[PDB]
């Protein structure tokens, strides 16, 4: 089999559609997600045309091997789609209607800047390369683009599944490539992060501040160093669920800034003790009394600055 | 091969049955489980009918390629099933009796709200797409739906394996589809969670309460802080075995509430010390004496409420 | 090809044998193990019979596609067996000698009750479904059941590889199934657990008992709490290497009981301090002196009782 | 099919090109990376020559099985590449233009000496083995070597993708082999390591140096030991993300040297206390006062040297 | 196709050779490694013989299906090797020269006794089963056994790749099997273990010994207990990367013995405090002064002894 010939000099229009059946395994570190969907292809092949009245059969059904099917591939897939051909239907006029069910691991980058209050646009790029005979061009049949209502992605809210109707036509290795952009819009469910990471992390920090109502250097050293230790664990815990980035993330900024607070609390605790030993507890008392106010405030303002910069 | 033609205008009824041989790998974080089962299909194809007299055979065996087999797929599978054909038998009226052995990774959501005292309903959805020639409809042959007695799922009690007899017929990509719902009912074996997570977590909390029978600020700070850090370990330990949810979980609620108790115990420990230093240990003594009773009581009440809200 | 016809009304006897070449990957959590073995099949097909005198060839060699081979499957395999056929030999009387080399992931439950002093019986179930023409029955050719001397399973002692000679014949989906039980007997190599888990865990416990020869509450508090946290690590470390069970394990019981000892030691440490503060160190001295004997004695007695219950 | 015949005694030139579509999964520990690219191949087979007048078509399209294709393999791949032929075009003279889309896990060693400020040269080696009939030689068509603009590798900056135009021709197992070297130049994005590992590690170190402004042995022991323990945590965390090397890495050197600082701080803390107990706090005061300066200075000097040695 | 017939009653000699292209993934816990190599096979098949004069070619090239190829398998592989036939060449005297490129996961046990100063001999066992027609025997063509210079195994030094020239012939299920032993000799790169595990572990131990120059029970308790806690981490960290063995390893012995040192240091610290409280610090002073010497000496001696027992 060879491609259908052009009536006039026109490129072949392959109408495409992706219908999500299942979406799963959004790996933040790998910046990948798995998808299970229907891929629909429609093009016209005059060689396959027939008479409806004469033939009696409204539609003719073919096996993939029997007819010419355009070679459609995904740009951003990790491991090549396992495809199932569901049906091939030919109209009297020669309009072919192809439908396959596929599953693929899609590689699509993520913006972690606003984590865990981030939204993402996942991309699925369809591509076709032109043949020497004729040029192939992709189009979106919006009637055949969608998703099942039950499509869920653990820890995410699925906003929309749409296609950018206009293909990106470009030359690559001296042949035309027609690229289509399917978009899955999702927003992270930040709920869990509040009682699991955010609040426990604030409690340990407030506990460190009780050292501002104590004169016991030994108790203070324990309060500040221990609580400090809990933070490293939280800091570490998160890095593990995140890939290295060239920029700072929201949670990353909060976590880093909290380190400075522990460092300064240690300084205060050290200063207060030093003065007490130098028999000047009135200076020490002033610093401790100030810190009670300054820490919470500065900390408070700084977060406002951070949230402002990040959102 | 093409579908069997309708005698009158009727849709083709494909009788289905799933018999579980094995169930394994229930991944809580992935919300998936693996299954190994028999899939039985039965439909009438008059074209294959024969007379037992002239043939001398009560049944006829065919190779899959030789005859028309309805394209049955699973909706909620991750990695498309690997199938083995066990046997294809044709009765004299042309009644086909198909049997395959398959294995598949099924994606079915889980409700973690009552963890680890939760029960789940796992779903296996069978589907068939109608062809242009005729409509294909699924039915359940309850005689061919079951499970082996030895079917086990590690850390779970297998309640039942049943099918919702009435299919969900609907349109998708301008063709009708007949969807069937097979249900595997399971309940979590919470036993382990008691000596592994629950009890150790209560012991560490109760240990923090000995600070209510001590005047030593340094010992108390050590008592609370140390006990506190262990809570974090458990809190983390659990969450790593569980996915992010938009709602609170029973264990999650208990764990979060326990953080508040440590926070308040730190406050009491701080308050008691402050008063002792301000040369007013009679006030301090009252608060500490109240704490010995209030903490346990409030804890008992709050837990009651939580269990009430969750069950 | 169709099954060999019965001379009289007899079922077809397929003689089976499994010869282990390799055993590996015993996953405790998954309750699975991987196996690489020879599968031998032997049955009589009279249609294949010949003359040795005139043919000049004692044995005739066939390709799988050329002859009828019984469909033998494994009941308990996690995933698809790679199968490669080494040889098919036909004796003059028509006795077929099939030999394949396979590899499979077998799912077989484990009893963790006596961990790490447990022994297990791994099962490999062979099965054959009877055809409409004739009934197929499995048999064990003990001559062709064995294992290579070099077969090893990391962290386990391989006791025996035997077959239960009598098949389990039963009806399933209105046809006879013939099931065979191959058994791999193994016992865990508990050596490592002594210097890695058991002894370190006892040392930390004994270190907490030094608090019985100290009057320093702050010191005692530190001893007991610090030692305590290490136990959680061991407790935690261990449980991660295990699946959740509906029962208590030996190690699990020891670990849980040790928590009670820390809890009571904290109580004693608290009591001793309280009395010392209430200016009654003679009562405190009696309790501490009793504790020095009592803890070890009880601990020892408790351990004996448990061992008794578990073995 | 056999190789095309020489027209003089010349070896067959297979022109090659690799165009990266996707690069992902750079595993530092495994020293591997996954790639998804186009493999272009061009050779001349005069046996495929045709007159466009007779055939109708200016360019002929063949299926891989139909014609002779040079056996091109990758030297440094983990499992055999996943390949799909995009197109096979033949021009009238018999010039074949082969295009396949492949994905492979490439094993290429990494130099960790400058981690996390290291750059790497990833290699992809193409190879062809000569036949007894004629010798096959590889060449680079620079017009068909490149990468998509959107090619990204998480945590890395992609510098260049080039080919060493001159093949490495050599004898192996009494036949000629033509090897080509494709190079992917990348440099690590060290940003994250600063707020995640480097800075937290320095803060904890400086927290320990506050022991130089304290006379409390008990507080100092807590400061130095506690802070010390966190270092082990960071030290360990880092090791996990790196493989064993026969050399010392930049981060590894910093981490190791920091251990010495804790060891010496413990000595100072011990010395200071010993003198204080021996009723000679004036000597102790001198050492502590020196330490306040020497530690930071020495540390600083040492880092410059190492920084210097490594770069 | 059938095997080449014997001229006299001789067994068929299949000359073998393995040439390593790549070595990777040495999994210590799994006791496996992955290999990518050339497998060369050579045997005489007289039926394939020809005259160079008549034929006009001095070599004949066949496709695998066309001729009889001996069924060579690997004994110790996890899954059946991924093989691609590179070439099949026939000399005029019926000498067949087969070449395939394969990749396989080899299961070969490791001796951890001297870890991390251990050397290993990895085995690759080639095997052939004799047919009813004739007996097959393996031989090593040393000219075709080798490895690429660039072959590396992360964290290991590759010593040699050789073959035991004499096969192990034996009966298995009443057929002769010819087994060959290919050996890959490797020695572990212990470098990393010194600054990563060994030295940090000695530093924490030495820090615990500073308790011998302190009278502060509370300070001492903190020193020993804290440091002890670091030891568990190292002990735990190590055991995670190593399988359970029925014998002690070198590192395992050092780690275990160090536990005894902490246990005895706790006893000394307890004893010293007890005497101090009983108003007898002169006895306490003697024990502490002895400990300063006895601990280091004993420790030193014990390792010498151990080093001796292990090497
Ligand atoms: C620890 C320090 C406190 C951290 C709090 C961060 C929350 C935040 O400030 O994040 C803000 C986000 C919502 O942002 P958005 O909908 O993406 O807006 C994008 C649109 N623009 C472009 C107009 C900005 O969170 C929430 O809706 C609820 C916050 C609950 C967290 C309670 C604690
Ligand atoms: C920490 C504080 C204590 C936590 C204990 C929570 C147990 C619970 O409250 O859970 C209750 C569950 C059973 O619930 P169900 O079978 O789903 O009932 C659903 C039907 N309704 C809606 C009518 C209620 O557990 C048990 O039978 C035994 C658990 C014993 C735990 C001992 C400690
Ligand atoms: C910490 C608390 C101490 C734990 C020690 C319990 C080990 C045990 O007592 O276990 C006993 C087992 C043997 O059991 P079996 O071979 O299955 O006997 C089954 C047959 N019966 C029913 C007739 C008995 O271990 C051993 O051979 C030696 C263990 C050395 C432990 C050293 C520490
Ligand atoms: C703990 C002590 C501090 C450790 C900091 C080491 C960083 C360094 O000194 O490394 C320097 C490297 C650059 O090296 P290069 O580009 O490979 O040089 C190759 C060319 N030559 C051979 C001519 C030199 O990083 C950077 O561009 C910025 C590092 C900012 C880090 C701030 C903290
Ligand atoms: C903690 C206590 C210190 C641990 C040191 C153990 C190292 C060892 O003693 O082992 C020695 C091994 C080499 O042994 P081999 O090559 O197997 O000799 C086999 C031949 N025979 C049979 C004659 C013995 O390491 C080394 O080359 C250098 C190790 C330096 C480590 C410095 C720290
Ligand atoms: Cl694709
Ligand atoms: Cl499916
Ligand atoms: Cl099977
Ligand atoms: Cl390859
Ligand atoms: Cl093999
Ligand atoms: Na302390």
Radius of gyration of chain A: 31 Å
The number of domains of chain A is 2
Strand elements of chain A, count? 11
Q: Give the oligomeric state.
A: homopentamer
Q: Which overall shape of chain A is indicated by the principal axes computed on the Cα atoms? A: rod-shaped
CATH topology of the largest domain in chain A: Acetylcholine Binding Protein, Chain: A
Query: Which pair of chains has the greatest number of interface residues, and how are they split between the two chains?
Result: A-D, 52 and 56 residues
Coarse structural class of chain A = alpha+beta
Which bin fits the share of residues in helices of chain A? 25-40%
Number of helices of chain A: 5
Query: For the terminal residues of chain A, how far apart are their CA atoms?
Result: 56 Å
For CATH, the homologous superfamily of the largest domain in chain A is named as Neurotransmitter-gated ion-channel ligand-binding domain
Main sheet properties of chain A: 7 strands, mixed
PDB class: membrane protein, transport protein
Keywords: Cys-loop receptor family, membrane protein, transport protein
Assembly: pentameric
Entry title: The GLIC pentameric Ligand-Gated Ion Channel Loop2-24' mutant reduced in solution
């Amino acid at each position: 089999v060879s491609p259908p010939p052009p009536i006039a000099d026109e490129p072949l229009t392959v109408n495409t559609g992706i219908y999500l059946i299942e979406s799963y395994s959004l790996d933040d570190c790998a910046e990948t997600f798995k998808v299970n969907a229907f891929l629909s292809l429609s093009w016209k092949d005059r060689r396959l045309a027939f008479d409806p009245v004469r033939s009696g059969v409204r539609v003719k059904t073919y096996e993939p091997e029997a007819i010419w099917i355009p070679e459609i591939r995904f740009v951003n897939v990790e491991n090549a789609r396992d495809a199932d051909v569901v049906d091939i239907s030919v109209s009297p006029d020669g309009t072919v209607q192809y439908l396959e069910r596929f599953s693929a691991r899609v590689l699509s980058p993520l913006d972690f800047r606003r984590y865990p209050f981030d939204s993402q646009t996942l991309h699925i790029y369809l591509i076709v390369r032109s043949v020497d005979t004729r040029n192939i061009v992709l189009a979106v049949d919006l009637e055949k683009v969608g998703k099942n209502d039950d499509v869920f992605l653990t820890g995410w809210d699925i906003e929309s599944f749409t296609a950018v109707v206009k293909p990106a036509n470009f030359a690559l290795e001296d042949r035309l490539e027609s690229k289509l952009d399917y978009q899955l819009r999702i927003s992270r469910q930040y709920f869990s992060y509040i009682p699991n990471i955010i609040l426990p992390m604030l409690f340990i920090l407030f506990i460190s501040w009780t050292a501002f109502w104590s004169t016991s250097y030994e108790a203070n050293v324990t309060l500040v160093v221990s609580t400090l230790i809990a933070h490293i664990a939280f800091n570490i815990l998160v890095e593990t669920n995140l890939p290295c980035t060239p920029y700072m993330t929201y949670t990353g900024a909060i976590i880093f800034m909290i380190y400075l607070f522990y460092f300064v609390a240690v300084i205060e605790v050290t200063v207060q003790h030093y003065l007490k030993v130098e028999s000047q507890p009135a200076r020490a008392a002033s610093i401790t009394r100030a810190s009670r106010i300054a820490f919470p405030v500065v900390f408070l303002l700084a977060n406002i600055i951070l949230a402002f910069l990040f959102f």
